[PDB]
Each structure stands twice: as C-alpha cells, then as structure tokens.
Design a protein around this ligand. Sequence first.
Ligand SMILES: *CC(=O)N1CCN(Cc2cnc(Cc3ccccc3)s2)CC1
Ligand SMILES: *CC(=O)N1CCN(Cc2cnc(Cc3ccccc3)s2)CC1
Lengths: 304, 304
Amino acid sequence: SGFRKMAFPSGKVEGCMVQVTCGTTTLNGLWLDDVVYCPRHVICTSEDMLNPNYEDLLIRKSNHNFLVQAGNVQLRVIGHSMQNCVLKLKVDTANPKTPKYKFVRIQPGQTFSVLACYNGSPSGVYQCAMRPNFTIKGSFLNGSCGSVGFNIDYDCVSFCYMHHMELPTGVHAGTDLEGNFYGPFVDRQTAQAAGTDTTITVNVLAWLYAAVINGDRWFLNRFTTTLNDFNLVAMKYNYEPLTQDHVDILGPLSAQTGIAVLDMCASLKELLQNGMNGRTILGSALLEDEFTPFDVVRQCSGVT
Amino acid sequence: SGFRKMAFPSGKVEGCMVQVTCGTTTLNGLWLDDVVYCPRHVICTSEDMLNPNYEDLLIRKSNHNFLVQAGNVQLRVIGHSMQNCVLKLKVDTANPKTPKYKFVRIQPGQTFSVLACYNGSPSGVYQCAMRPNFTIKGSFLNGSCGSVGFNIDYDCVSFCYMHHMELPTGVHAGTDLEGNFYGPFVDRQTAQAAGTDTTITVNVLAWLYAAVINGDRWFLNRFTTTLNDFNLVAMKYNYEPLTQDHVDILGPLSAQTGIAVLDMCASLKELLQNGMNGRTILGSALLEDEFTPFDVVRQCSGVT
Ligand SMILES: *CC(=O)N1CCN(Cc2cnc(Cc3ccccc3)s2)CC1
Ligand SMILES: *CC(=O)N1CCN(Cc2cnc(Cc3ccccc3)s2)CC1
C-alpha cells in the first residue's frame, strides 16, 4: 500500500545523455543509435535568441562546430540537420547503451518522467504532466535544455518531450523528439503567455480511486451525478470536461473498487463545492491531477 | 526555475537489483561486489512470520536454497550469513555494475530516493523522508521487500534503507544495510503501532526558502520571532523543535534570499496559526517537509 508520485526508473535514459556545445552554449543531447538530438537554440548566442533565423544561423555552422561529449569521451560529428526545432547530429558511433525506443507525441493530460540533466549529466528524475495549456511544470535551470521526458513499457522507452524553454511565468515549454513544440510556443525570447491551466479531471478521478484502494475513503458520499451535471460543475471550477472516453478508461478502477464512475464524479463534485475542510487525501490538501488512470493501475499492480 | 519532488537518477541502483527466492517467497536483493543483501524474512513461510525464530529457521537453509537471479541469469551462492535483520548471500561473481558505494544510517528528517522493485526488476523511483517516528511513507506492494533507499554524491551511492514491512496503518518500516531497523520495529507480523508523525520543521523552512527563490512570496510577513517563541508554536502544531543546528544549516538559504532564518520562522508561525486561506505554495496546499536544506540547495543549484 501507499501511493507516491513515482517516476520511471531512469537508467535506460541516463545511458543516452550527452553534452552538446556550440560556441559558448552548452546543453544536453539525447544519443540514440548514431544520432544526437538537441534543441536547435544551441546555435544561438544570447543576442540571437531575441529574433533568431535558425536556417541562417545554421549556415555558419559545420559538423566540427558541434562538440558532443558522452561522459569524458568526444563523439565525432559526421552530419547535421535541422528537423523543426531540434538538431540531429549524426555521429560516427552508435550509442552502445541505446535502449529499445520510440518517439511519441503525447496529448495534454498525459504524464511522463523527466530526467533533469546538466552538461550531459543526470541530476534528478521527477514526474510531470503535459498541462491542458501545453506547458509543463518542471524544475529546470539554465543548462537543463535538451533534458527529456519519457515513458517506459517494459523495455521500450517512449520519448515524448525535450526541454527548450521557460516562459516569463516560470512554466516550461518544449518539443516532442521530432522537434515540434507542444502548444503554440516558439524558441524565441519573446512575449509568450500560457492559456488557462485547467485541471485534468480524468486524472483527479483516477487519483480518487487510488485513494480508495489505499484506504483514504472519507470523501466518498451518498450521491451520484450525470456526465452533463458533473460537467457544469467542472466548467465552473476550470476542470476539463469529462467524456464517455474518460469514463471508459476509468472502467478498471471502477471495477476494482466497486465504485461507479459517476458516483466518484459526485464525490469530486462535493469536494469542488465544499472544499477539503482542512482534511487531506493521499497526503495532499489539493486534488492531484498528475496521475493518469494508467499510472494508478500501474502503481497499484506493480508493473516492472 | 520550478521546484519538484525529485529523486536521484536510479541507474546506478538498477544495476544492483536482483531477485532472491527461498522456497515459496520471492523478494528483491541488492548485489554489491560478491554479496547479495536481502531481508532475512525471505526464509519465512506466511505461518513463520507470526513469531519467527530466524536463527532456527536459518539452520534448515543451505546455500543452494537461496535462488538469486540477476536479469535472466542465475548467481551461484557460495556462502550465507545473517547480520541483524538482513541476510548476506556471498555469490561467486562480483557484480560488474557495482558502483562506488557506502552504507549509511540516516537520521529522522533525512530524505532519500527509493527504487521500488518487484522480482528484481525496477518499477519506479520516488523521494521519501525518514519520518520522526522512524517510519517512511512509501509505495510498496507485496514483492517490493528488499527494495532500497539511497542518496548519491556525484558517483558514490550511499544506501540507507532496505524495505522490510508495512504496518497495519499503511506506513512502512525497514532497516539500514547493516540490517538494523529504523525505530523500534521488528520483522514479525505483530501489533506494531507508530508514534507521532511530527512535521520536520527544518525541512519546511528549507522548502519555504525554495518557494521564495522560485517566486512564491505571498506568505512572507512583516514579523520576526525567537527560537523559543517559534518552538512554543511548533510544539502546539506537532512540529519538531527547531535548534541552533537547524538555523545554522539554513544559513546558505538565508544568505541567498536575504531572509533571516527567524523571519522565515515567523512566516511559518503565521501559516501554522492562520492556515493557507485556500492559497498554495509551490503547487501545494500543505507545508511540505520532505525536502532537506541540502535538497533545496542541490536542486536550486543543479548538482549532477
Ligand atoms: C534551457 C537552457 O538550458 N538554455 C536556454 C536558456 N539559456 C539562457 C542563457 C543564455 N546564455 C547564458 C549565459 C550568458 C548570460 C549573459 C550574457 C551572455 C551569456 S544563460 C541557457 C540555455
Ligand atoms: C514486503 C514483501 O515483499 N514481503 C513481505 C510480506 N509478504 C506477504 C506475503 C507472504 N506470503 C504471501 C503469499 C501467500 C499468501 C497467503 C498464503 C500463502 C502465501 S504474500 C510478501 C513479501
């Protein structure tokens, strides 16, 4: 028993982290097979970041300008190309620690682990969610760009995020491993405001199910509701609308606990309307939304 | 910017996890050099756990009864011994992935990362703290025993915890790597109640400093207090007494923010007395106590 904000084991990803330096900028790269992926803003000076023309800046760079170091050994760059907002640096050596992998583009509400790195070296691992406004709330200092987000399915690492920037409000933006930003963000030091950071309703319900499985049951009430009634309340509280797809995904949790999804929605509705009254659920005084239904099943079952 | 509950990268520890089976019980083992460490209750049947005499049960076990598997390859056991509540299984092969390591016994209030494992395979990593009542609030299912807690200092892993049991209240108990339980707990299926789970005051103050460094400043007030006055309030709220040693340890955070430790104590005193009033600090609606002052400095500076 017990329920924790749990990250995937990071070993498979640690073996892929490298340092990439172009001129005076050093950030992280992801080395998979004979390609190193990194944010294209590694070619920028702090002056360039204000309004960079990446194609033009890249013309002044040659393979030998990209210094790639894996541990304390230098990798030989034999090609370079820009794919959207990432650079792909072809090296002459395949990463011998390359795990089975995929590049996936996640949907808002999906969680993933981040291996925060500096100078190609891992500093820590934590769990994030792609917010409904396409930002993530991470922990990233200067030098952390190029750190990646991922999920693991037994032995296959699905990379979903590469860190590129921090908005003026302290929230984070990045791309998938094809270099496409999540949301409307651009790799430019310009006015970029995030939209409404709504709560991931389906995740909150999954976490309420985890609470029941782990013994926290005070919030269970004698009520039920409908999808439409619940959604009127969810709209009022800046929660994402709950769909039949979300109800279906919560089916295994509903089956395990014997609590119908709509009954849990009515418990959530009362928590939104009445608050916690100074009480806690799974050690939290707020409704946690960074556990998906899959995460709750995975953690409550013990998938390795 | 941003502040997350961050675990150490788990790769160095993943390379040490093995499966240990004795009869019908399978749990995790830690393989360092040519020794595999595991909870001694691996020799128990569910019937034995009620009142086990470990020395007597161990007499009926031989080296060949301890099945140790690292990945899909079997390790040859050439010796076995009991040290307190752990068994040390000498194998004929040194773990080629053994990192630089130490065995440390932590004090309450200290944090560490846990690599939750099942059948010698890593499932996830999360951050814990040794509670003042010597329990930890983990996420452990049956089969997770033998999973370990650790800290890392650059390339040296300091192992501090091995998981042994869950109390009837859903909290966890275990040993250091010398096999001595933290607290008064015993490896027996018997009535073991935990003492008061008080809040780790020095950790809360460190986390308030992290909040200020990361932009959350609403809770800063116009007041100050003294150690004795603050401690009268801390006693009332089941917070650990703050000592001059704790004040000294908070010195670098005080210096970085320009907020004197006693002024932060006065902010904490008002938060205890008035509550949060529906507001949050670093995404939390409660005062977080599982970040030490060292953790805050480490994360806010980017140590790898
Ligand atoms: C996320 C990440 O690692 N990066 C993107 C943001 N930059 C910010 C900086 C750029 N240059 C720096 C050093 C400097 C400061 C002032 C004048 C000249 C150079 S920090 C870091 C990389
Ligand atoms: C923490 C950990 O991994 N362990 C300590 C607690 N045991 C509990 C169990 C013991 N035997 C089990 C299977 C069984 C159930 C009922 C009757 C006979 C066998 S679960 C697991 C290991």
